[PDB]
Amino acid sequence: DVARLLALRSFTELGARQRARALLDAGSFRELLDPFAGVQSPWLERQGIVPQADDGVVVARGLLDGQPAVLAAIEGAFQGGSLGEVSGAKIAGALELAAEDNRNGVPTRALLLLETGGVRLQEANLGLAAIAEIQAAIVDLQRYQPVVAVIAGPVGCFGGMSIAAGLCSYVLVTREARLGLNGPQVIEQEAGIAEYDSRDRPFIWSLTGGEQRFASGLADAYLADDLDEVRTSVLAYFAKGLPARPRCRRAEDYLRRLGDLDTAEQPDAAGVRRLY
Amino acid sequence: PPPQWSRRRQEKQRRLERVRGLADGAVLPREGLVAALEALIAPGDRVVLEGNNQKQADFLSRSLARVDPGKLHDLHMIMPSVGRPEHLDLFELGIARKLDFSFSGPQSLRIGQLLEDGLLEIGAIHTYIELYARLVVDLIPNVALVAGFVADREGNVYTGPSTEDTPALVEPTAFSDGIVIVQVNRIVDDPRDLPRVDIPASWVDFVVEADQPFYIEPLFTRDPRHIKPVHVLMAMMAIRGIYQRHNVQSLNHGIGFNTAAIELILPTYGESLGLKGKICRHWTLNPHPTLIPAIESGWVESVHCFGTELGMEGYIAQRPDVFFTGRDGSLRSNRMFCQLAGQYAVDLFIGATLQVDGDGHSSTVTRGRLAGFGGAPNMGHDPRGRRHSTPAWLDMRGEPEALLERGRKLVVQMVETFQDGGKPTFVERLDALEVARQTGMPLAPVMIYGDDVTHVLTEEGIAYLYKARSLEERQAMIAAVAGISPIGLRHDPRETQRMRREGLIALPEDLGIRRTDASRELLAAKSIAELVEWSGGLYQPPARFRSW
Amino acid sequence: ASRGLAWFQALAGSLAPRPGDPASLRVADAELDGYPVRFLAVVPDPDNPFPRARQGEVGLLEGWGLAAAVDEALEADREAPRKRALLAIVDVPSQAYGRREEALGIHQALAGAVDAYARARLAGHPLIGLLVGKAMSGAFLAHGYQANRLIALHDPGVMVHAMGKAAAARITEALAAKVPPMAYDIDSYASLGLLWRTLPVETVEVPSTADLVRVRTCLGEALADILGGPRDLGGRLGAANREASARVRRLLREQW
Amino acid sequence: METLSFEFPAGQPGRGRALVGCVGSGDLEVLLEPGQPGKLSIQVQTSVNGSASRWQHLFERLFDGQTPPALLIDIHDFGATPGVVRLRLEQGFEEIG
């Protein structure tokens, strides 16, 4: 089956713009604030850092199965996908317009492709402020339409935007996805090598990888790194509409299971799957 | 031609013979002009009398006021501009009774005064070209009293830079067996010394050498010394948020300091935006001295002129690529033709006003003061007979693929939220409403109606009214830029952000403008003397504006 | 023990945690100018079941607990004549860093908090964040950053940022005074247009009687400024330093 | 003529001083000096009678949702429009920082 192996169409291979063009209905892709608009970071140059013209986020309108849609995709290759003033505002602003579409009869859905290492330090407080607006906009929009967050790798999703991911109606992941609040190196240097070893990649993936997140119910779907399969899963979850009982509204249940936990010793992947 | 079909021609013939002894062919003696006027005009006559915006037939005007009211009374005056004291003297003296007019400036109080006392009746307040229009329908005149620079003995008249309303006033009078009297500054014996013919001898019945040169008012000349930072701020937002935004190629500026400020910062602020040659190429405008630096800098490709601004004549004669000049080399203004162009052929009108209400209705008529509309109604409305597209005019459509949606002319009301004297500009009710009730006018004398306005521009920002989809939304937009005026106090400031984001309004900072950047330093010329400098000494300011 | 704890006690009088809450949360209902109010403050719990969340951090229990307390008020007031104000007293050093935290999905717990708050604000609850000390990173996101109005005490101990000075400087002193979004001081943060008011106090660690008078008056005015107006966060887009945030939204609607 | 006093919540004292404008007709001057923390004190002397609530509105909008530096502001107004007043106040605050 060389033919199959020669025909692999990986989703994680694609850049952000490529991922966005692929997931939207063929022909429907239309980018807002595209690189020729020149709307880049106003902060990076004075700091000696070369800007990207779309500031590392692709925002496109289009269709998802005939239906009105907007898609924001973070380019993990620029600044490690860490969000700045402009990139943050592009995502938040788009989510905001989608909610407003819905209040005017138009059932616009948002797709979020989250390749991001959190907040951008050179624009720190503007990146964090934007993430707050991103989060607000997700909650607003999800009174009308579920937001699907796709986490595929290689960067995965960390920091403020992992919290944003937790807000989403549906979180779809690959095996190569990591979804976590703090990055491994930071936990190591805050809590010690004993707490967390940043060089142990199999350990890291065992706790924060896509496979584990899905198995522990912190993710809703576990997809092959395959373009067709990812679009198919995306289209299916939008078609489900809003979940009856999303993760976020289950504070009572999480707080109760967390109570039953003996926290004296460090849990492992298996324990977490058991606890939930 | 049969007698019963030629009564007007017969009546003219009888008037002409009552001065045949008194006159030498077409030439009237300056000494017997008053006698001539009592012979040639009859009581009840419709008399066109040049109060143009600038040119005054003031010899004829003063001579008419010295007439025996027992011989001439109940005259129906038709005047484009009613500015001079003798004009209203006619009514007080009982020589005149009715008045149709377009513009009044100073005499605004006096006209109201004469109206209450029953010494003057207003037919209607018009816009200039509307008034010319009636002259071949509704108000065919009996007599025209007009002015020129030079005549020959046969009646050909040169009017030059001050042509203005004259051909529009004389043609309906000359060709309806009416009587045309022209005062000229000098009569030449050699008909070849006439620099150009503007009004042919055929149209003219009598000429008179005036006792002195006919009075010229520099109506649109503005002293750049009086331009303040708040003007410059509004002017910056006009250029950036309107001219550039909508790619405006052609325009008229209404009178005033607000527009003068725009003109004076094109070669500074406009230059900084990189817009030279890209906007404001073609003008319908009086030759504002304040436009001189835009012209020298190469912004202004063409200007067609309503009239002339005293002292600009020599400068215009050295700019024939820009202005319309005759074979003698001097300006040929034409108020009718320019007003027509201002309506039909130009992207945008922008002007100031004294009062705006919550619906955008705009007026200069305030209590006791019957100010005329002048040109503002003709140029500040969407000309609904227009069919030719232009990019700015198309830019106003909400749906550029809707083939049945027509474009709109840009009509901007540019004004500070408050007037100099402490009264707010934006009011809950126009003074004009009560003036109509007191004057018995069937409708409020509104200069420009709120449904014609595409942009309200204020020191606070721009309201893009053309985007309003209901009256209520238009009110909200006006209130958002009306400041702390009674209209502005209706605005909830927590609504401003949304209006900004949706593009309903733009604050200066939406336009990349920092308010504190507005200052006189942006003015390309700071004074009249600097205007003369920019003109290479060609501009000769009238005494009024001299500091030397 | 923490500025947050002190100010919760100064404002709510109450001090013992509700049975049912984590020991890291202080919740109390009261009134402000006769308007129903619920105070909310994360505070240190040195006996936290989770060892990494014992110096005031927002960890698993803090995130989910906040979600529960806010959901409680949201539900209780669903038909009430007035939705009660939620006053977040913000003083959080950080997110909890640890293996339990990541393994159990601390990101998801903090999301529960954000979701609750935002849903409360959208439903007409007035949220006010009162920054009495540190407001850092995801801890601030989960506790405070969804507020209709943010008020900061004008004090050098009051600091908003995405990471601690130590961590920033280690991945790199305060050269960040050159770049407002990078700076730590409250004046720089203010210049981003994100605060509705700042107010200096007499004695920040234990508010004076005159301090409480000013703070309570301020909170009253914020409450008044919220009611009846837009429930979104658009009031945060007014400053020159956030020019680009406003421009992006303008450009997005033009092209939408 | 009247003399009016206003007070507003403010932050830390501004630390420069500034003078903007002139008491020409239709204009005003504004003196701006460091004030007492938490407080902005404004004194207005104006030729226009009965304009107190106008000045109140003007300042309210100027300071809406943005804590100015604590300053002492002395205004001498000879009938400037609210537009001119606002512009000068912004010029003054600009120099002070």
Residue numbers in the entry:
A (entry chain D): 3 to 278
B (entry chain A): 7 to 554
C (entry chain E): 6 to 177, 185 to 268
D (entry chain C): 1 to 97
What do the authors report?
The malonyl-ACP is decarboxylated in the second step of the reaction to regenerate acetyl-ACP, which is catalyzed by MdcD (30 kD) and MdcE (28 kD).
We next determined the crystal structure at 2.2 Å resolution of the MDC hetero-tetramer, with the MdcA, MdcD, and MdcE subunits from P. aeruginosa and the MdcC subunit from P. fluorescens. The hybrid hetero-tetramer with the P. fluorescens MdcC, which has 76% identity with P. aeruginosa MdcC, produced much better crystals. MdcC did not carry the prosthetic group, as we were not able to express the modifying enzymes in E. coli. A malonate molecule from the crystallization solution is bound in the MdcA active site (see below), so this structure is actually the complex with malonate. The current atomic model has good agreement with the crystallographic data and the expected bond lengths, bond angles and other geometric parameters. The four copies of the hetero-tetramers in the asymmetric unit have similar conformation, with overall rms distances of 0.2–0.4 Å between any pair of their equivalent Cα atoms. The structure therefore indicates that MdcC is an important bridging subunit, mediating the formation of the hetero-tetramer, while the contact between MdcA and MdcD–MdcE (400 Å2) is likely too small to form a stable sub-complex. The active site of MdcA is located at the interface between its AN and AC domains. One of the carboxylates (C1) of malonate has bidentate ion-pair interactions with Arg341, and its two oxygens are also hydrogen-bonded to the side chains of Asn292 and Gln345, respectively. The methylene group (C2) of malonate is situated above the phenyl ring of Phe312.
